[PDB]
Each structure stands twice: as C-alpha cells, then as structure tokens.
Design a protein around this ligand. Structure first.
Ligand SMILES: O=C(N[C@H](c1ccccc1O)P(=O)(O)O)c1cc2ccccc2s1
Ligand SMILES: [Zn+2]
Ligand SMILES: [Zn+2]
Ligand SMILES: [Zn+2]
Length: 231
C-alpha cells in the first residue's frame, strides 16, 4: 500500500495516511542519474497541520503544499526540518513564501548556512544535548545525539505511536550506508539506542527514505552502520 519509488512519477508528491491525523509525504529526486524516494511527516493539530521536512526541493515542496490543500484542506502553519541537508530544508523558501513558519534547531540553522542551503526562520530551543526532548504542538522532538548528521532530530507522535526517524533511520531494503559524509559513525549506534530507550512503545517507524516498518528498523540501521564502520 505504501507508495514506492517506481510508483510515483518524478515531481509528484503522494500522501499516505498512517493513523488518524498522521500522514507521511513521499516525493522523488532524480539526481546523478538515479531516482530516490524521500519521506516527511504531516501531523494534524486541531484545525491546522504541522509539517515535518520539505519534499527535497522547491518544485517538489510546491507540489507538496498543493497536494496537502487538495487532499487534507487544512493549513500548514508550522514546519520543522530535522537536519540541515537539502532533502530536509530544500523548499524552506517555498514554505516561507506561502506563509508557513519554519523551524529548526540552532545547530541545524548554522550547518544549513555553512552549506549554502535554505535556512529555517525560527530556532528550536531545548535540543542541544543528546537525550533532550521538547513538545512542539502535537509531536515530541527528540535529539538522540549525532548519527546521520550531528544535528539530526527525530519526531514522535504520541497519539498515534508513530516514530519518524528521518535520515538517522534506514529502511530495511537499504543494506549499505551509501553517502555518510557528515555522519558521526562512532556515535550513531549509541544515538539509535537512545531512540529505542525513549520510544519503546512506537508501533510505526518511518525512515527518511523508503518503506516504514517497526522498531526493527533501528537495529537494522545499527547493523548497516557498524558494517560500514568496519568496511
Ligand atoms: O536522499 C538521499 N540522500 C540525501 C542527500 C543526498 C545528496 C545531497 C543532499 C541530500 O540531502 P541525505 O544523505 O539523506 O541527506 C538518499 C536516499 C536514498 C534512498 C535509497 C537509496 C539510497 C539513497 S541516498
Ligand atoms: Zn542528510
Ligand atoms: Zn515566525
Ligand atoms: Zn535523507
């Protein structure tokens, strides 16, 4: 049922309802000659929506807003980017122009600026040390420690037991690390264990790219990371 890379024409955005008031958004980026899927999250909060992550690029993010208006019809009032790379912040300027208040940790904003990427407007306090958590509308934001990037956040929806791992969590079909240029390989397994410790009740786990599963995705990611460490 979950849309896969091949089932989404490039440039389009699909929404997948995970639970009451919780969707993922799925988009594609054809880069270096190959096609990659990417996930973000949408969480209802009363009569408004919280967006987690852009759809990787201005045109994709414009299509995301159009699909949200078409299928859900509630306004996106805030957005959080979970780390500084273009698959999370590319499209922030589109969100800002549409009147969405954009947020990231101060570490993410700084890294995005250094990279020349788009920079969310607001700074999320209370997330600077591993293990820190804060509530943000209908979600909890959690900084597990450095992993895929030093600034990566994860997002938990307590009403639905949905854990969105972003790019710190790999889908099961990804058995090699790929590009990890900004990762902390040494800390990544420890950061994953903090996620497990904090969200042992999670029933759905959404990776940054590809198919959702359960908490098994965490130990799978640790296995991939450790194998890459010993490469
Ligand atoms: O989007 C992916 N990389 C992200 C990325 C790459 C380059 C520049 C910016 C950027 O944000 P990332 O490293 O997540 O930030 C990938 C997704 C998939 C999916 C399946 C198999 C391999 C890959 S590689
Ligand atoms: Zn990244
Ligand atoms: Zn504002
Ligand atoms: Zn990613």
């Amino acid at each position: 049922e979950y849309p896969t890379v091949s089932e989404i024409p490039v440039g389009e955005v699909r929404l997948y309802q995970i639970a009451d008031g919780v969707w993922s958004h799925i988009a594609t980026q054809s880069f270096d000659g190959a096609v990659y899927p990417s996930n973000g999250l949408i969480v209802r909060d009363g009569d408004e929506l919280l967006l987690i992550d852009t759809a990787w690029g201005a045109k994709n993010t414009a299509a995301l807003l159009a699909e949200i208006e078409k299928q859900i019809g509630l306004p996106v009032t805030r957005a959080v980017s979970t780390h500084f790379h273009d698959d999370r912040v590319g499209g922030v300027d589109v969100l800002r122009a549409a009147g969405v208040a954009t947020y990231a940790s101060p570490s993410t904003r700084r890294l995005a600026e250094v990279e020349g990427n788009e920079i969310p407007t607001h700074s999320l306090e209370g997330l600077s040390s591993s293990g820190d958590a804060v509530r943000f509308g209908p979600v909890e934001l959690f900084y597990p420690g450095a992993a895929h990037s030093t600034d990566n956040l994860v997002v938990y929806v307590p009403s639905a037991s949905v854990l969105y791992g972003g790019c710190a969590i790999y889908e099961l079909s990804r058995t090699s690390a790929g590009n990890v240029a900004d990762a902390d390989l040494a800390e990544w397994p420890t950061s994953i264990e903090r996620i497990q410790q904090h969200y042992p009740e999670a029933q759905f786990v959404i990776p940054g790219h590809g198919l959702p599963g359960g908490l098994d995705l965490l130990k799978h990611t640790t296995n991939v990371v450790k194998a890459h460490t010993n490469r």
